[PDB]
Amino acid sequence: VSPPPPIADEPLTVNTGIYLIECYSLDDKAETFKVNAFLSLSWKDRRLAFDPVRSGVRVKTYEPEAIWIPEIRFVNVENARDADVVDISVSPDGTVQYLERFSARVLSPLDFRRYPFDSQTLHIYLIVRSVDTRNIVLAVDLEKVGKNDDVFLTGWDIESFTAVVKPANFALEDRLESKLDYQLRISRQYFSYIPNIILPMLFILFISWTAFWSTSYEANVTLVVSTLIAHIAFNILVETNLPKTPYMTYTGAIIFMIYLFYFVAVIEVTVQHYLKVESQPARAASITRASRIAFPVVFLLANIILAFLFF
Amino acid sequence: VSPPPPIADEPLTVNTGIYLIECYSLDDKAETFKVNAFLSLSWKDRRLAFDPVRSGVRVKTYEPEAIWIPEIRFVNVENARDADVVDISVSPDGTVQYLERFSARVLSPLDFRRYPFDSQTLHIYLIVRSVDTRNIVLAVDLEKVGKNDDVFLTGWDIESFTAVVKPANFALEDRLESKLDYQLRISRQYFSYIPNIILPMLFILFISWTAFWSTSYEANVTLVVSTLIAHIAFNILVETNLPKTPYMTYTGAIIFMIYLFYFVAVIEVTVQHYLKVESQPARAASITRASRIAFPVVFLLANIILAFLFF
Amino acid sequence: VSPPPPIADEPLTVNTGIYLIECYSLDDKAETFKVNAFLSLSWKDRRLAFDPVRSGVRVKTYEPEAIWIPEIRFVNVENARDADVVDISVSPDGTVQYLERFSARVLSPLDFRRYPFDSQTLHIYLIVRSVDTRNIVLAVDLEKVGKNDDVFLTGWDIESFTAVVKPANFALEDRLESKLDYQLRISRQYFSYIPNIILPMLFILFISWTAFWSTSYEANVTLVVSTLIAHIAFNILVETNLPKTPYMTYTGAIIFMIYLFYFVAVIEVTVQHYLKVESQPARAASITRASRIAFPVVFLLANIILAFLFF
Amino acid sequence: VSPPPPIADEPLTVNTGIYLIECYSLDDKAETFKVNAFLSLSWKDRRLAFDPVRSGVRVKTYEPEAIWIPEIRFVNVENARDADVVDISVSPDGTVQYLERFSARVLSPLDFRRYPFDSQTLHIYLIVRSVDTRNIVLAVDLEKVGKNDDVFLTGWDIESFTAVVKPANFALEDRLESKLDYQLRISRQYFSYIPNIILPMLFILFISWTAFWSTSYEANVTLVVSTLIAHIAFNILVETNLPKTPYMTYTGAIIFMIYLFYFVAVIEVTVQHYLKVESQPARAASITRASRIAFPVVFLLANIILAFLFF
Amino acid sequence: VSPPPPIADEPLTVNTGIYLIECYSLDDKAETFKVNAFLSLSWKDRRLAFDPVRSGVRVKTYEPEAIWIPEIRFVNVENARDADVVDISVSPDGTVQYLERFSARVLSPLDFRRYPFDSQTLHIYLIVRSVDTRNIVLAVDLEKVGKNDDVFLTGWDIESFTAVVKPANFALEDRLESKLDYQLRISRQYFSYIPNIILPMLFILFISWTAFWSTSYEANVTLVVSTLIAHIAFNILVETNLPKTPYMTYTGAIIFMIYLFYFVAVIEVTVQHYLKVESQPARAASITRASRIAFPVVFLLANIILAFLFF
Ligand SMILES: [Cl-]
Ligand SMILES: [Cl-]
Ligand SMILES: [Cl-]
Ligand SMILES: [Cl-]
Ligand SMILES: [Cl-]
Ligand code: NA
Ligand code: NA
Ligand code: NA
Ligand code: NA
Numbered sequence A, B, C, D, E: 001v002s003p004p005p006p007i008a009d010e011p012l013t014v015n016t017g018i019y020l021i022e023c024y025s026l027d028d029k030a031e032t033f034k035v036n037a038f039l040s041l042s043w044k045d046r047r048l049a050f051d052p053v054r055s056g057v058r059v060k061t062y063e064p065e066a067i068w069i070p071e072i073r074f075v076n077v078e079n080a081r082d083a084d085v086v087d088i089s090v091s092p093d094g095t096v097q098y099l100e101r102f103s104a105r106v107l108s109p110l111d112f113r114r115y116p117f118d119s120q121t122l123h124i125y126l127i128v129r130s131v132d133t134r135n136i137v138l139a140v141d142l143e144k145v146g147k148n149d150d151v152f153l154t155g156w157d158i159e160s161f162t163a164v165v166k167p168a169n170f171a172l173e174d175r176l177e178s179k180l181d182y183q184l185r186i187s188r189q190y191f192s193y194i195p196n197i198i199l200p201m202l203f204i205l206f207i208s209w210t211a212f213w214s215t216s217y218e219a220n221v222t223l224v225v226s227t228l229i230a231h232i233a234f235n236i237l238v239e240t241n242l243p244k245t246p247y248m249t250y251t252g253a254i255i256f257m258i259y260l261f262y263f264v265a266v267i268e269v270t271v272q273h274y275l276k277v278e279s280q281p282a283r284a285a286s287i288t289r290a291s292r293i294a295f296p297v298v299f300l301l302a303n304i305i306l307a308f309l310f311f
């Protein structure tokens, strides 16, 4: 089998569509997601044309091996898609209608800057390479692009699944290549981060601030050091669910800043004890009273600054 | 091979059945389960009809390649099922009896709202896409739906395995689609959660309340902060066995609430010490005595409210 | 190819044997084990009979496709076995000798009640489904059941590998099915649990009891709470190596009971401090002295009771 | 099919190229990375030459089975590459242009000496084994070596992808072998290590040094021991992301050195308390005051020495 | 295809060789390692004799399916090897030279008694089962046994790769089996265990001994209990990298012994406090002073005894 010959010198247009059946395993660390979908393909092959009257059939079914089928690949996949051909239908003018159901693990970079209040644009890049006989170009049949209502991505809200209609045509290894960009827009369900990470992290921090109403150095050291350790545990927990980024994430920024608050609270607790030992408690009392206001105030203002820089 | 032609204009009815052999790996985080089962298919193919008197044979056995077989797929699977054809039998009237043994990983969302006292309805969706020649519709042969007595799903009780007899017939990409819903009803074995998570978590909380019978600030800080850290460990343990949900789970609610109790206990311990230092212990004594009753009482009432909202 | 036809109306007897080459990956959480073995099959196919004199051979070697072979399956496997046919030999009277080497992941429930001093009976269920033409029954050739001397299952002692000679014959979807039960009896190597989990857990508990020779509330709180946290770590460690069971395991029972001892030790430490503050130390001394005997005594008796209930 | 015969006695030159499409999963512990790329092959097969004016076709497209193709393998792969042939083009003179898209898991040792400020040279070794008929030698077509602009390796910066043009030709098992070295130069994005590991580790160390402004032994013991435990947690965290090396890494060296600082701080805290108990506080004061300067100074100088030895 | 016929009554000798290309993933817990190697096979099949004059060629190249190939298997593999035939060369007398490149996961028990200062002998067992026509025996072609210079096993030093030239010929299920033992001698790179586990574990132990220069019970309890918890963390860390053994490992013995030292240190700290409270500090001072010498001395002697028993 060889590609359909051109009537003049036109390129062969392969109309494409992706209909999402399943979306699962969005792995943040790996920056991958798994997809199960219908891939539809359509092109004209004159050599397969027939007369409906003398045939007695309005449509003709073929096995993939019997006819020429464009070698369509995905750019951003780990391994080649697992595909099973569903149907191949030919109309009288030789218009081929191809349908396969496939599953693939897609590599798509994620921007963690606003995590866990982030939104992403996942990409599925469709590609075809041209042959010596003719140049093969991809198009989007919008009537064949969509997603099942039951499509759920655990921990995310699916906003839209659209295709950029104009392909990116370019040369690669002395042949032209036609690339389509299918975009799946998603937004993270931040809900669970609030009772599981955010609030627990704030509670332990506020507990360290009770040291500003205590003159007991031994108790103060216990309050600040114990909560710091619990903060380290949350830092470790958070970083294990995320990849290493060459930039600061919103959560990473807050987590890092909270260390500074623990560090300054230890300085305050130290200074307070030092003055008490030096028989200067009136002074220590002035520093401690100021700290009661300064710590929550600087914490609120630093958070307003951070939220501003990130959102 | 082509589909059996209609005598009139009727759709082809494919009778189905699923007999569960094995159920394993119910993964809460992934919202998946693995299944090993018999899939039975039955349809009439008049082209295969024969005479039983002259053939001397009551049944004819065919190899899958020799005859037309409907392309039946599962909707909610990760990858296409791993199937091995067991038997194909044709009766004299041309009724085909197909049997395969398959294994598949099924995506089925779980409702964690009542965790670990939750029940689930797992779904296995069977599907067939109509061909151009004719419309294919699915039916349930209840005589061929069931499960082996030895079917066990570790950590769960299997209640029932039934099929919704009426298929969901709908158009998808300009063809008809016929979908059947096989339902596996299960209830979680909550037993182990009691000695492993629930009771240990209650013991550490009750240990924090011994601070209400102590005037030692240093010891109190140690009691409340140490148990809080142990509570954090249980929170982390629990959340690692669960996916992130856009709702509160029953266990999540209790775990979150317990932080408030630790926070208020720290306030009490702080207020008590502050008054003692200010030479007001009679007052501190009134707050501490009230706390001895208030803490267990508010804990019980808050739990009654939560159990009511969730069950 | 079709099954051997019956001389009268007898079922076809397929003689079986399993010879274990490798046993590995006994996963307690998954309740699975991996096996690599020889599967031997033997049956009479008269159509294959020959005269040794005429042919000039005592045996005939065929390829699997050339002759009829029974469709033998394993019941309790994750996926169908990975098999490679080793040999097919036909004797003059049509006695077929089939040999394959296979590997499979077996699902076999485990009874954790006596963990880590438990013994198990792993099962490998062999099955055959009858055909329209012939009822197929399985038998055990004891001469072909065994295991290699080098067969080792890490963390277990292999006791015996035997087959229940009488198959379990039953109807499944209007066809006879013949099931054989191959049993691999194993006993857990409990050795390592002693220095790694049991003794460390006892040491920290005994360390909490040193609080009965101390009047220092602050030191007592540190002793009991710190060791309780270390006990929580062991509880978590143990539960990660085990599945969730709807029953108490021996280790689970001891681990749970030890929490009660920590809880009562905190009550004692609290009561002691309370009396000391109330200027009643003579009393506190009576409770503390009683506790020094009561705690180890009640611990020993409770352990005797538990060992009795479990063994 | 057999290899193209030599006109004289020359070896067959197979021109190669690798064009990277995807780079993912650089696993530090495993010392592996996954690759998805185009592999291009070119050689002269005179038996395939044709007339351009007579044939009318400028290029002939063959199926892999139809012609002889060199058996090209990767040396440093876990399993054989997953490959799909894209195109085979023959020019009139018999110059074959072969193109496949492959995916593979590559074993490439990493030098962790300067971690997390390390750079690596990943290798992909291409190999061909000669046949009895003739010797096969590999060459690099630089025009067909490259990488897609979108190629991203999470946590790394990609510097260059080049090939050492001269193959390593050697005898192995009495036949010639021709090996090419494709080099992917990368540098680690150390950014995230600063707020996640480095700074938190420095903060806890500096917190241990507040004990030099405290006379409270009980508080000092709490400060030094608590922070030491947090240092152990960071040591464990770091070592889990790295393989075991027969050399010290930069981070490993700093982490190890910090233990010595904790050990000496405990000695200081002990010596200070001992002198205070012996009624020699003036002296303890001399040691403590010296420690305030000595600890940060020795820490800075030791770090300058270490950075010098490693960079 | 059938086996080559015997000229007399001799068994068919299949000469073997294994040339290691890659060694990776030595998993201590699983007691497995992955291998990528050349497997060479050589046997005489006179039925394949040819005249170079008539056929033109000096050596014939065959496809595996075209000729008889001995069914060679590995005994100690998880699954059957992934093999790719590189060449099948037949010389005029009928001597076949078979070459394949394979990858396999090998089960080979490890002796952890001296861990992490242990050495191992990994085995790769090659096997052939005899057929009816004739008995097959394996031999080692030493000229075809070896390893690539670049063969590295992360965390190990490779000493030698040799074959026991004499096969183990034995009866199995009424047929002969011929087994060869390929041995890969390795020694563990213990380096990293010193700064990561050994020294940190010794530092925390020595820190607990500072309690022998302190009269502060509250500080002593903190020193001994905190370092004990850090010791538990190292115990858990070590045991996660190792399988459960029915014997004591060297590291396991040291780790276990260190618990006894913590237990006795708690007794000492308790006894000291008890005497101080009873107004007997002179006695307490005698016990504490003795402990300063006894603890490091008994620790050194116990380690000399342990090293002697293990090495
Ligand atoms: Cl693809
Ligand atoms: Cl399916
Ligand atoms: Cl099977
Ligand atoms: Cl390869
Ligand atoms: Cl093998
Ligand atoms: Na085609
Ligand atoms: Na068919
Ligand atoms: Na057959
Ligand atoms: Na070829």
Ligand code: NA
Pocket: A222, B222, C222, D222, E222
């Ligand atoms: Na303390």
Ligand code: NA
Pocket: E001, E064, E065, E066, E067, E068, E069
């Ligand atoms: Na063969």
